[PDB]
Amino acid sequence: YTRVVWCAVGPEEQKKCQQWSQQSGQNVTCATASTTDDCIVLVLKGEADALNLDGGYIYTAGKCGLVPVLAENRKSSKHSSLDCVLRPTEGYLAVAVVKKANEGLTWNSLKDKKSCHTAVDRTAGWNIPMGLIVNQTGSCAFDEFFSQSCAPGADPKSRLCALCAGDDQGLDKCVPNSKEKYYGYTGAFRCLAEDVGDVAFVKNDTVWENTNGESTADWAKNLKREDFRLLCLDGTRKPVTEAQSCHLAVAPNHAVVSRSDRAAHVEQVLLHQQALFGKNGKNCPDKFCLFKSETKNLLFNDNTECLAKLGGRPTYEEYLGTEYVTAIANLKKCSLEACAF
């Protein structure tokens, strides 16, 4: 049993995975697909074992029978005595971010503006904001709400992809993987930073991690936190320090999923793999770190301190929470219970 097949989304994740594979002595090997959905299909077919997923994708995976295994745990300030692996996860803050200089833009004036989304089907980038917008407008036409968008995974010729940029060669426009310039947390924040969009749907951490010298990347080098504002549901604008009083939702952390017949073994191997290449890993600062990919968030989020045990051996619904599961199901009616594949 002792060989885990990890699924990588896109060529950049594939490269990192290959490095991990070499360093793990082939205890981990690599399968690769173009999209997260395609990776879930590989796992369902038994052609890969596992991958780490945003909550929106956990919903897709879970409807198809895949189970949560371990969750991303970032650094916190509660349960400080417990080991990271045993410390309870605290979830992240889904936010809507704008430029301070874009004065008078509020939650209530988002119609017909330009939006930047992590990807279709993702928690902070899509399910939360679009679910909120569908409810408030009483309309399923979320594809006509914003004048233009970058929402990787949408129809490339549609307005929802109009702001996406693709790769260096301008290939792979609006593809839901790291090849797309504006993909994921960092890509969506870049879309806002460069004024391609008026609003970015990301998480609190993303803003902090890419401002005030935290990034060094060419587009982020010079970005200041005070130049950004958060949009609150009450129509107010707040500095990015008040994320706890001005968010769209609290999201369940990204988590590893696998088939239930492989979950126990995937868990065993990963706990060992992070002991070697995780935050305080025996071979991280010397050979390879599993949670570092130059602010690109490949395979895992770069802010992951460890993968933590779940406890309560939760179903995918228990992991996501009944509050969030029903929120997706209400949004999915616009696009009742079955596997998508």
Ligand X SMILES: OC[C@H]1O[C@@H](O[C@@H]2[C@H](O)[C@@H](O)[C@H](O[C@H]3[C@H](O)[C@@H](O)[C@@H](O)O[C@@H]3CO)O[C@@H]2CO)[C@H](O)[C@@H](O)[C@@H]1O
Ligand Y SMILES: *[C@@H]1O[C@H](CO)[C@@H](O[C@@H]2O[C@H](CO)[C@@H](O[C@H]3O[C@H](CO)[C@@H](O)[C@H](O)[C@@H]3O)[C@H](O)[C@H]2NC(C)=O)[C@H](O)[C@H]1NC(C)=O
Ligand Z SMILES: *[C@@H]1O[C@H](CO)[C@@H](O[C@@H]2O[C@H](CO)[C@@H](O)[C@H](O)[C@H]2NC(C)=O)[C@H](O)[C@H]1NC(C)=O
Q: Is 131 in the site for ligand Y (CB under 6 A)?
A: yes
Shortest Cβ 264–ligand Z spacing (Å): 13
CA dihedral of residues 129, 133, 139, 144 (deg, nearest 10): -70
Stretch near Fe ion under the rule CB under 5 A, chosen from 73-81, 121-129, 240-248, 321-329 = 121-129
Site track 243-272 with ligand X (rule: CB under 6 A), x = hit: -------xxx--------------------
Stretch near ligand X under the rule CB under 6 A, chosen from 38-46, 89-97, 164-172, 188-196 = 89-97
Stretch near Fe ion under the rule CB under 5 A, chosen from 36-44, 51-59, 62-70, 215-223 = 51-59
Shortest Cβ 76–ligand Y spacing (Å): 6
Q: How far apart are CA 219 and CA 6, in angstroms?
A: 31
Q: How far apart are CA 174 and CA 271, in angstroms?
A: 35
Q: Which is nearer to ligand X, 115 or 123 (CB)?
A: 123
Helices 263-277, 10-23: inter-axial angle, 10-degree rounding? 80
Beta strand 148-150 pairing with 114-117: parallel
Which of 24, 177, 178, 210 touches ligand Z (CB under 6 A)? 24
Point out the residue whose Cβ comes nearest to Zn ion. 318
Shortest Cβ 205–ligand Y spacing (Å): 4
Which of 318, 326, 330, 333 touches ligand X (CB under 6 A)? 318
Three-state DSSP class for 241? coil
Helices 322-331, 128-137: inter-axial angle, 10-degree rounding? 60
Residue 311 labelled as part of a binding site: no
Shortest Cβ 257–ligand Z spacing (Å): 21
Number of residues lying near ligand Z (CB under 6 A): 4
Asked if residues 109 and 119 have their Cβ atoms less than 8 Å apart, the reply is no
DSSP 8-state assignment for residue 159: G
Q: Is 330 in the site for ligand Y (CB under 6 A)?
A: yes
Which of 1, 2, 25, 77 touches ligand Y (CB under 6 A)? 77
Q: Which one of Fe ion, ligand Y, ligand X, none is in contact with 54 (Cβ closer than 5 to 8 A by kind)?
A: Fe ion
Residue count (the chain): 341
Which of 323, 330, 339, 341 touches ligand X (CB under 6 A)? 323
Residue where the block lists tokens 């609290």: 250
Q: How far apart are CA 138 and CA 141, in angstroms?
A: 9
Q: Which one of ligand Z, ligand X, Zn ion, none is in contact with 27 (Cβ closer than 5 to 8 A by kind)?
A: ligand Z
Residue 54 labelled as part of a binding site: yes
Measure CA of the first residue to CA of the last residue in the chain; give whole Å: 27
Residue 200 labelled as part of a binding site: no
3-state secondary structure 31-97: EEECCHHHHHHHHHHCCCCEEEECHHHHHHHHHCCCEEEEEEEECCCCCCCCCCCCCCCCCEEEEEE
Contacts with ligand X, residue ranges (CB under 6 A)? 89-91, 250-252, 312, 314, 318-319, 321-324
